[PDB]
Swiss-Prot record:
Disulfide-bonded cysteines: none
Name recorded for this polypeptide: Mitochondrial distribution and morphology protein 12
Subunit structure and binding partners: Component of the ER-mitochondria encounter structure (ERMES) or MDM complex, composed of MMM1, MDM10, MDM12 and MDM34. A MMM1 homodimer associates with one molecule of MDM12 on each side in a pairwise head-to-tail manner, and the SMP-LTD domains of MMM1 and MDM12 generate a continuous hydrophobic tunnel for phospholipid trafficking.
GO annotation, cellular component aspect: endoplasmic reticulum membrane; ERMES complex
Domain of life: Eukaryota
Gene Ontology MF, one: lipid binding
Species of origin: Kluyveromyces lactis (strain ATCC 8585 / CBS 2359 / DSM 70799 / NBRC 1267 / NRRL Y-1140 / WM37) (Yeast)
SMP-LTD domain: residues covered: 2-214
Amino acid sequence: HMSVEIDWDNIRGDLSVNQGVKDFLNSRLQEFELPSYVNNLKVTNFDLGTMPPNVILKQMDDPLDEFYNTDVQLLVELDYKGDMSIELSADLVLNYPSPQFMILPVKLRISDIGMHCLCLLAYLKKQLFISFLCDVSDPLLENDKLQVDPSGPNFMGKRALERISLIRNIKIHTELGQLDSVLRSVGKLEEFLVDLFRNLIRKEAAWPSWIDLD
Ligand SMILES: CCCCCCCC/C=C\CCCCCCCC(=O)O[C@H](COC(=O)CCCCCCCCCCCCCCC)COP(=O)(O)OCCN
Ligand SMILES: [K+]
C-alpha cells in the first residue's frame, strides 16, 4: 500500500536498540542445550547492516491486547536483503582422538540473512515489540488458510503451525585462530548454530512471541 523511508543512520547508531537485541538473544540462548562439541555460547556483537529493509506499511491499528492514542501498531512487509551480522563466541570442544582432547575459543558470525516477511511492530509505553508473522510467499496466504489482519477475527489461527521458513537464506562464518581435525568440529558447530538461530527466531521472535525492546 505505502512505502516508508527509514533513517538507517539513526537506527544503526542507537546504542539502546543494539544492546537490547543482544539482551534478547543471550537471554533466549540460555534455553538451548549445548551438545558435546560446544561450551559457553554467547552473542558478543551485533551489527545492523549498511542497508535498511524495504518497508511497506500495510495497516495501522491499536496494539493487540496480548501486548498489554498514542500507542500504535503497524502491519508491515519487511524485505530485508542487507548485511546485518551477529557475532557469537564459544569454546569449541574437540572430542577426537580422545573426549575433550582440546578446547579452543572460536568466534562465529551469522550474516547474509535474507527475509521477506509480514511483521507486526507495536509501539506502546516507549517500548517497541517486533513480531514476525510469516514469509510473504507462504502458501497459506495464497490458499487463504492463514489470516494476517490483526483487527482481525481469525488472526493467526491454528494453521500457523505449518508456516514456512521465516529465513530465506543465512550464512555463518568462523574466523580462524585455530591452526592446531578442527574443521570437522567447526562444521558441526556451524550447522548446529544455523539451526539454533532458525529455531530461536521461529520460537521467540515470531508470533505469538516477539522481540521486546526499549
Ligand atoms: C536475531 C534478530 C536480530 C535482528 C532482530 C531485529 C533487530 C532489528 C533491529 C532494530 C529494530 C528497528 C528499530 C526501529 C526504530 C523504531 C522506529 C523508528 O524510529 O522509526 C519510526 C517509523 O519507522 C518505522 O516504521 C520503523 C520500521 C523499521 C522496522 C525495522 C525492522 C528491522 C528489520 C530488520 C530486518 C529483519 C532481519 C531480522 C534478522 C533475523 C519513527 O517512530 P516514531 O513513532 O516517530 O517515534 C517512536 C520513537 N520510538
Ligand atoms: K557442551
